[PDB]
Design a protein around this motif. Structure first.
Motif, PDB file in Angstrom:
ATOM      1  N   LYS A 268       2.736  10.964  -6.361  1.00 55.26           N
ATOM      2  CA  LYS A 268       3.647  11.650  -7.270  1.00 55.26           C
ATOM      3  C   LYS A 268       3.041  11.763  -8.664  1.00 55.26           C
ATOM      4  N   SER A 269       2.285  10.745  -9.083  1.00 55.88           N
ATOM      5  CA  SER A 269       1.652  10.779 -10.398  1.00 55.88           C
ATOM      6  C   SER A 269       0.648  11.919 -10.503  1.00 55.88           C
ATOM      7  N   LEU A 270      -0.085  12.194  -9.421  1.00 55.36           N
ATOM      8  CA  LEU A 270      -1.066  13.274  -9.431  1.00 55.36           C
ATOM      9  C   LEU A 270      -0.403  14.631  -9.631  1.00 55.36           C
ATOM     10  N   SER A 271       0.881  14.755  -9.282  1.00 56.66           N
ATOM     11  CA  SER A 271       1.560  16.044  -9.346  1.00 56.66           C
ATOM     12  C   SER A 271       1.633  16.602 -10.763  1.00 56.66           C
ATOM     13  N   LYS A 272       1.423  15.771 -11.782  1.00 57.65           N
ATOM     14  CA  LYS A 272       1.418  16.253 -13.155  1.00 57.65           C
ATOM     15  C   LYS A 272       0.158  17.077 -13.421  1.00 57.65           C
ATOM     16  N   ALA A 273       0.030  17.551 -14.658  1.00 57.04           N
ATOM     17  CA  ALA A 273      -1.130  18.315 -15.106  1.00 57.04           C
ATOM     18  C   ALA A 273      -1.996  17.492 -16.054  1.00 57.04           C
ATOM     19  N   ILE A 274      -2.136  16.200 -15.761  1.00 53.91           N
ATOM     20  CA  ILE A 274      -2.919  15.286 -16.583  1.00 53.91           C
ATOM     21  C   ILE A 274      -4.393  15.663 -16.498  1.00 53.91           C
ATOM     22  N   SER A 275      -5.198  15.127 -17.413  1.00 54.85           N
ATOM     23  CA  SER A 275      -6.622  15.432 -17.438  1.00 54.85           C
ATOM     24  C   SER A 275      -7.300  14.938 -16.166  1.00 54.85           C
ATOM     25  N   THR A 276      -8.413  15.590 -15.818  1.00 54.68           N
ATOM     26  CA  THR A 276      -9.112  15.260 -14.580  1.00 54.68           C
ATOM     27  C   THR A 276      -9.600  13.818 -14.570  1.00 54.68           C
ATOM     28  N   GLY A 277      -9.925  13.262 -15.738  1.00 53.86           N
ATOM     29  CA  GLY A 277     -10.355  11.873 -15.787  1.00 53.86           C
ATOM     30  C   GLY A 277      -9.279  10.909 -15.325  1.00 53.86           C
ATOM     31  N   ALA A 278      -8.034  11.147 -15.743  1.00 52.91           N
ATOM     32  CA  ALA A 278      -6.933  10.300 -15.298  1.00 52.91           C
ATOM     33  C   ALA A 278      -6.731  10.404 -13.791  1.00 52.91           C
ATOM     34  N   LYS A 279      -6.842  11.616 -13.239  1.00 56.83           N
ATOM     35  CA  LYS A 279      -6.735  11.781 -11.793  1.00 56.83           C
ATOM     36  C   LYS A 279      -7.852  11.039 -11.072  1.00 56.83           C
ATOM     37  N   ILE A 280      -9.072  11.109 -11.611  1.00 56.44           N
ATOM     38  CA  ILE A 280     -10.193  10.385 -11.021  1.00 56.44           C
ATOM     39  C   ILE A 280      -9.905   8.892 -11.015  1.00 56.44           C
ATOM     40  N   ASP A 281      -9.422   8.366 -12.142  1.00 57.42           N
ATOM     41  CA  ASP A 281      -9.129   6.937 -12.217  1.00 57.42           C
ATOM     42  C   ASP A 281      -8.030   6.545 -11.236  1.00 57.42           C
ATOM     43  N   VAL A 282      -6.986   7.368 -11.125  1.00 55.20           N
ATOM     44  CA  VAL A 282      -5.873   7.045 -10.234  1.00 55.20           C
ATOM     45  C   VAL A 282      -6.337   7.018  -8.782  1.00 55.20           C
ATOM     46  N   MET A 283      -7.014   8.078  -8.340  1.00 57.39           N
ATOM     47  CA  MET A 283      -7.417   8.100  -6.942  1.00 57.39           C
ATOM     48  C   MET A 283      -8.538   7.112  -6.649  1.00 57.39           C
ATOM     49  N   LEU A 284      -9.330   6.740  -7.655  1.00 54.99           N
ATOM     50  CA  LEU A 284     -10.207   5.588  -7.498  1.00 54.99           C
ATOM     51  C   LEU A 284      -9.404   4.304  -7.355  1.00 54.99           C
ATOM     52  N   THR A 285      -8.221   4.237  -7.972  1.00 54.44           N
ATOM     53  CA  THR A 285      -7.362   3.072  -7.780  1.00 54.44           C
ATOM     54  C   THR A 285      -6.849   2.986  -6.346  1.00 54.44           C
ATOM     55  N   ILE A 286      -6.440   4.114  -5.755  1.00 52.58           N
ATOM     56  CA  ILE A 286      -6.073   4.057  -4.330  1.00 52.58           C
ATOM     57  C   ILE A 286      -7.287   3.718  -3.466  1.00 52.58           C
ATOM     58  N   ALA A 287      -8.469   4.220  -3.831  1.00 49.90           N
ATOM     59  CA  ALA A 287      -9.666   3.833  -3.084  1.00 49.90           C
ATOM     60  C   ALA A 287      -9.919   2.330  -3.169  1.00 49.90           C
ATOM     61  N   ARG A 288      -9.732   1.750  -4.354  1.00 46.07           N
ATOM     62  CA  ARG A 288      -9.871   0.309  -4.526  1.00 46.07           C
ATOM     63  C   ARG A 288      -8.822  -0.446  -3.719  1.00 46.07           C
TER      64      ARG A 288
ATOM     65  N   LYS B 285       0.813  -1.211   0.000  1.00 48.21           N
ATOM     66  CA  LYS B 285       0.000   0.000   0.000  1.00 48.21           C
ATOM     67  C   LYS B 285       0.850   1.266   0.000  1.00 48.21           C
ATOM     68  N   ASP B 286       1.928   1.290   0.787  1.00 46.77           N
ATOM     69  CA  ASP B 286       2.668   2.532   0.996  1.00 46.77           C
ATOM     70  C   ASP B 286       3.355   3.002  -0.282  1.00 46.77           C
ATOM     71  N   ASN B 287       4.103   2.114  -0.941  1.00 44.27           N
ATOM     72  CA  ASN B 287       4.830   2.524  -2.138  1.00 44.27           C
ATOM     73  C   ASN B 287       3.878   2.822  -3.292  1.00 44.27           C
ATOM     74  N   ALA B 288       2.781   2.067  -3.395  1.00 42.45           N
ATOM     75  CA  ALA B 288       1.761   2.384  -4.391  1.00 42.45           C
ATOM     76  C   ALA B 288       1.169   3.764  -4.144  1.00 42.45           C
ATOM     77  N   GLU B 289       0.889   4.085  -2.878  1.00 40.08           N
ATOM     78  CA  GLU B 289       0.364   5.402  -2.543  1.00 40.08           C
ATOM     79  C   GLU B 289       1.359   6.495  -2.905  1.00 40.08           C
ATOM     80  N   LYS B 290       2.646   6.273  -2.625  1.00 43.66           N
ATOM     81  CA  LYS B 290       3.655   7.263  -2.998  1.00 43.66           C
ATOM     82  C   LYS B 290       3.708   7.455  -4.510  1.00 43.66           C
ATOM     83  N   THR B 291       3.687   6.354  -5.265  1.00 45.90           N
ATOM     84  CA  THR B 291       3.777   6.450  -6.719  1.00 45.90           C
ATOM     85  C   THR B 291       2.581   7.192  -7.304  1.00 45.90           C
ATOM     86  N   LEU B 292       1.373   6.902  -6.814  1.00 45.60           N
ATOM     87  CA  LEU B 292       0.196   7.584  -7.352  1.00 45.60           C
ATOM     88  C   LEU B 292       0.076   9.017  -6.844  1.00 45.60           C
TER      89      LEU B 292
END
Lengths: 33, 397, 51
Positions: B129-149, B120-127
């Motif tokens: 850091k991934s959010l720090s980009k300026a990617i589209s809001t849909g990708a951010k939604i999918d990523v943080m839904l992945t941490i929720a999952r 959990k910890d390293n996955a949380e760190k990687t995602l």
């Protein structure tokens, strides 16, 4: 800030009620008759 | 076709919780053990193998899943090799200085493989850091839904709560109704988990139509949860229009024994089939609540309120029902019915007084003004105490 | 069209069936969708239409 030294710390040498379980009541004795 | 991918696999945690309960049958426990060992071998649950062997199982049986160090090292070495390969890909993309979409995607790849093994910890760190980009809001939604999952995977409900409140905070910056329905299903599952069943009923009943989040659970289990909550909360009108006539449920009733049992219990309650209601309730308690995860912790809570609901339905219409007639209707002994009914009266949950001299169960009708006044008094007292505490905290500063 | 002036001539051909499916999927994530809509079938039915 007070240490409360007069009262020593004790030494050791989504939830409400529902602490009991009904278990398998069944009561098939009524179904017997 | 697009998919958020079955990472982490929910069935792993489902069968892990099925294994960790002595209440469930031994045969089902061994089936869960076989499934979990097969999935550990195939999908490389090495960190989750270590966690399951050292906590969970042996924390509280446990012979089938035995902590083998050698199997913990070989699969861990394979996992570390895969992580090294992903790091090579990320570093090669950075060296080539490709588009920031590509580096963000590489971050998602690293995080999804970290989730794919259970850390959990390293996955949380990687995602994070991934959010720090300026990617589209849909990708951010999918990523943080992945941490929720992931939070759902390890059965830490507060993790899911913080992830989903983060989802809701930024969901207004998006608007895509599919990505909002995904969050609705996740929020409904989380609400069902922590003993709420009110929002859970609404969101699960709605989600029966739009359920594209198969990475959380299969459609059959979603139908089971929705039926359970709708039965447990809704009123005799909402049942007639949400759970007993919904074509989504109608087409899927004859597909699973658990769904069949729950639907039979619901139709028995709605059709006044009070004769076989209790055996149906016991069958549902045996087949729908204990085997699951989010429900087995609430096995007592659901069962207790079902008896209250059936008693309220029986005693709403009649006013001077006899105890013998009630016992005959429910197929139980009169003394047992009195013992059962003596628990819902003292807390003023039911509405009746038992006249034991004759056997009459004469009904008492309360005034909603009294209950509303008591509730308002209690809520005002709580808010006033909270406000006084906060004010005492802030005036000194 | 003389070389030295405007450089790259990029083609946007009418979308294929896979491209049509992708576009339909992208624009379909804006409305409440019933589960299990076979968008690939709809795009395969959509011939000639583009963008």
């Amino acid at each position: 800030d007070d240490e409360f030294e007069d009262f020593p710390i004790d030494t050791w040498a989504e939830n409400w009620d529902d602490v009991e379980v009904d278990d398998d009541f069944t009561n098939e004795l009524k179904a017997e008759l | 076709d697009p998919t958020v991918n079955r990472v982490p696999n929910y069935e792993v945690s489902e069968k892990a919780f099925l294994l960790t309960q002595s209440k469930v049958s031994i045969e089902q426990r061994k089936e869960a053990a076989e499934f979990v060992l097969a999935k550990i071998k195939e999908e490389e649950m090495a960190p989750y193998y270590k966690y399951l062997c050292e906590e969970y199982l042996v924390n509280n049986l446990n012979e089938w899943i035995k902590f083998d160090q050698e199997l913990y090292n070989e699969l861990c070495k394979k996992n570390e090799s895969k992580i090294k390969e992903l790091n090579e890909k990320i570093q090669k993309l950075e060296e080539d200085d490709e588009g920031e979409l590509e580096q963000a995607q590489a971050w998602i790849n690293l995080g999804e493989y970290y989730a794919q093994i259970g850390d959990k910890d390293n996955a949380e760190k990687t995602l994070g850091k991934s959010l720090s980009k300026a990617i589209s809001t849909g990708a951010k939604i999918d990523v943080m839904l992945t941490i929720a999952r992931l939070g759902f995977f390890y059965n830490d409900q507060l993790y899911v709560k913080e992830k989903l409140e983060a989802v809701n905070s930024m969901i207004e910056k998006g608007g895509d109704w599919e990505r909002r329905n995904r969050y609705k299903t996740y929020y409904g599952i989380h609400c069902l988990a922590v003993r709420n069943f009110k929002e859970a009923a609404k969101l699960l009943v709605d989600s029966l139509a739009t359920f594209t989040s198969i990475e959380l659970t299969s459609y059959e289990s979603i139908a089971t949860y929705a039926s359970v909550t709708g039965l447990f909360t809704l009123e005799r009108t909402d049942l007639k229009s949400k759970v007993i006539d919904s074509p989504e449920l109608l087409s899927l009733i004859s597909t699973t024994a658990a769904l069949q049992s729950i639907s039979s219990l619901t139709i028995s309650l709605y059709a006044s089939d009070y004769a076989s209601y209790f055996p149906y309730l016991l069958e549902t308690y045996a087949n729908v609540l204990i085997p699951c995860k989010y429900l087995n912790r609430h096995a007592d809570f659901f069962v207790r309120e079902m008896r209250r609901k059936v008693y309220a339905q029986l005693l709403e219409s009649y006013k001077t029902l006899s105890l013998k007639s009630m016992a005959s209707a429910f197929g139980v002994s009169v003394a047992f019915l009195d013992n059962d009914l003596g628990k819902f009266i003292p807390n003023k949950q039911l509405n009746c007084v038992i006249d034991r001299v004759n056997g009459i169960v004469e009904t008492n009708r309360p005034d909603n003004k009294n209950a509303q006044y008591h509730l308002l008094v209690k809520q005002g007292d709580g808010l006033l105490t909270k406000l006084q505490k906060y004010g005492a905290a802030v005036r000194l500063t | 069209l003389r070389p030295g002036r405007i450089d790259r001539k990029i083609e946007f051909p009418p979308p294929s069936v896979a491209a049509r499916a992708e576009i339909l999927r992208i624009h379909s994530r804006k409305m409440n969708l019933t589960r299990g809509i076979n968008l690939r079938k709809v795009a395969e039915k959509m011939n000639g239409c583009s963008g």
